[PDB]
Amino acid sequence: PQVTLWQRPLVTIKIGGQLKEALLDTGADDTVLEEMSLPGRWKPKMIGGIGGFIKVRQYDQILIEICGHKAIGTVLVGPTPVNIIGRNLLTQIGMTLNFPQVTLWQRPLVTIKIGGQLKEALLDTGADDTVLEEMSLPGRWKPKMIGGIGGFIKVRQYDQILIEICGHKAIGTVLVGPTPVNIIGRNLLTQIGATLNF
């Protein structure tokens, strides 16, 4: 199955006897699921994301079926706004990122050039938007707030911004704010024909 990114890459997952929809997030190291009844022993833990940090329970050796493919791994249950399938599980179902082909055993970082500066960014299929760390950018912007795992952050919106991603050019909206890492969302990934194969 091959997935384009014009729409959030949602899939069906069966976990703990229950059926849920979850987002294939190349930008997440871990898999985070909304609060749900899970049998077993857990361990308190915290994870970071945009907007802040959240407290979650960690369950190891959990079985999960993603689009028919079974997989066993660590699962984090917590106050997430969306069920997220991170790289720990994506690699188990042979998930690849084709735009070159990128495996997910390592965070999918690529180099981008924007505003005459070179930076590294994370290819995030789980993000609708592209949010970059504070930086000198010409043009006029507009205030805006986006949400993430730990909450909402205030960012400056710039439209019609040229970006060269791993070689290819693309023009689109870029949000600039307090992000822990530069994020390339679906509004640009689609422009460089990035597909998700597994």
Side-chain angles (χ1 to χ4, degrees):
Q2 180 173 56
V3 190
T4 58
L5 297 160
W6 297 95
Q7 51 185 51
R8 292 168 182 282
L10 280 182
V11 303
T12 299
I13 60 168
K14 183 182 180 184
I15 175 178
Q18 307 157 59
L19 307 185
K20 298 177 179 303
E21 290 225 84
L23 189 78
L24 299 179
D25 197 339
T26 57
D29 304 317
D30 327 298
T31 289
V32 197
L33 300 164
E34 49 178 40
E35 192 57 57
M36 68 169 268
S37 179
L38 275 187
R41 178 195 186 65
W42 52 281
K43 305 179 60 184
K45 185 180 179 183
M46 299 178 91
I47 60 166
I50 268 173
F53 53 77
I54 64 165
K55 225 246 63 182
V56 297
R57 338 299 171 299
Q58 182 191 316
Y59 296 71
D60 308 300
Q61 297 298 62
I62 299 297
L63 175 65
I64 175 172
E65 289 199 57
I66 314 167
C67 282
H69 306 75
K70 303 167 193 173
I72 291 185
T74 304
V75 166
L76 304 184
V77 183
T80 308
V82 191
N83 291 321
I84 288 165
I85 306 298
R87 292 184 303 100
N88 62 307
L89 290 184
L90 294 174
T91 52
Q92 288 193 63
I93 62 184
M95 198 76 245
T96 54
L97 196 38
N98 305 274
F99 70 94
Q101 182 182 63
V102 192
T103 66
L104 295 149
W105 294 97
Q106 317 187 70
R107 286 190 187 183
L109 288 172
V110 293
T111 71
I112 61 175
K113 176 182 186 185
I114 174 183
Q117 309 167 63
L118 311 181
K119 294 180 177 300
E120 288 191 292
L122 189 68
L123 304 178
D124 197 351
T125 57
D128 308 341
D129 298 339
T130 295
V131 61
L132 307 172
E133 60 174 297
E134 292 296 333
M135 68 177 281
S136 165
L137 236 63
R140 183 173 178 171
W141 53 278
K142 298 185 178 180
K144 183 180 172 182
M145 298 165 276
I146 58 165
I149 279 304
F152 291 70
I153 66 168
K154 213 203 75 61
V155 300
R156 308 199 297 276
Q157 182 186 328
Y158 292 74
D159 306 80
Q160 317 288 62
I161 296 301
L162 176 68
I163 299 188
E164 288 200 58
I165 307 167
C166 239
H168 314 65
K169 295 170 187 175
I171 293 187
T173 300
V174 155
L175 305 181
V176 195
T179 314
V181 299
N182 296 315
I183 286 301
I184 308 296
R186 294 184 301 101
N187 72 305
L188 292 181
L189 295 176
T190 49
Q191 280 186 52
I192 63 183
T195 64
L196 210 39
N197 302 57
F198 73 87

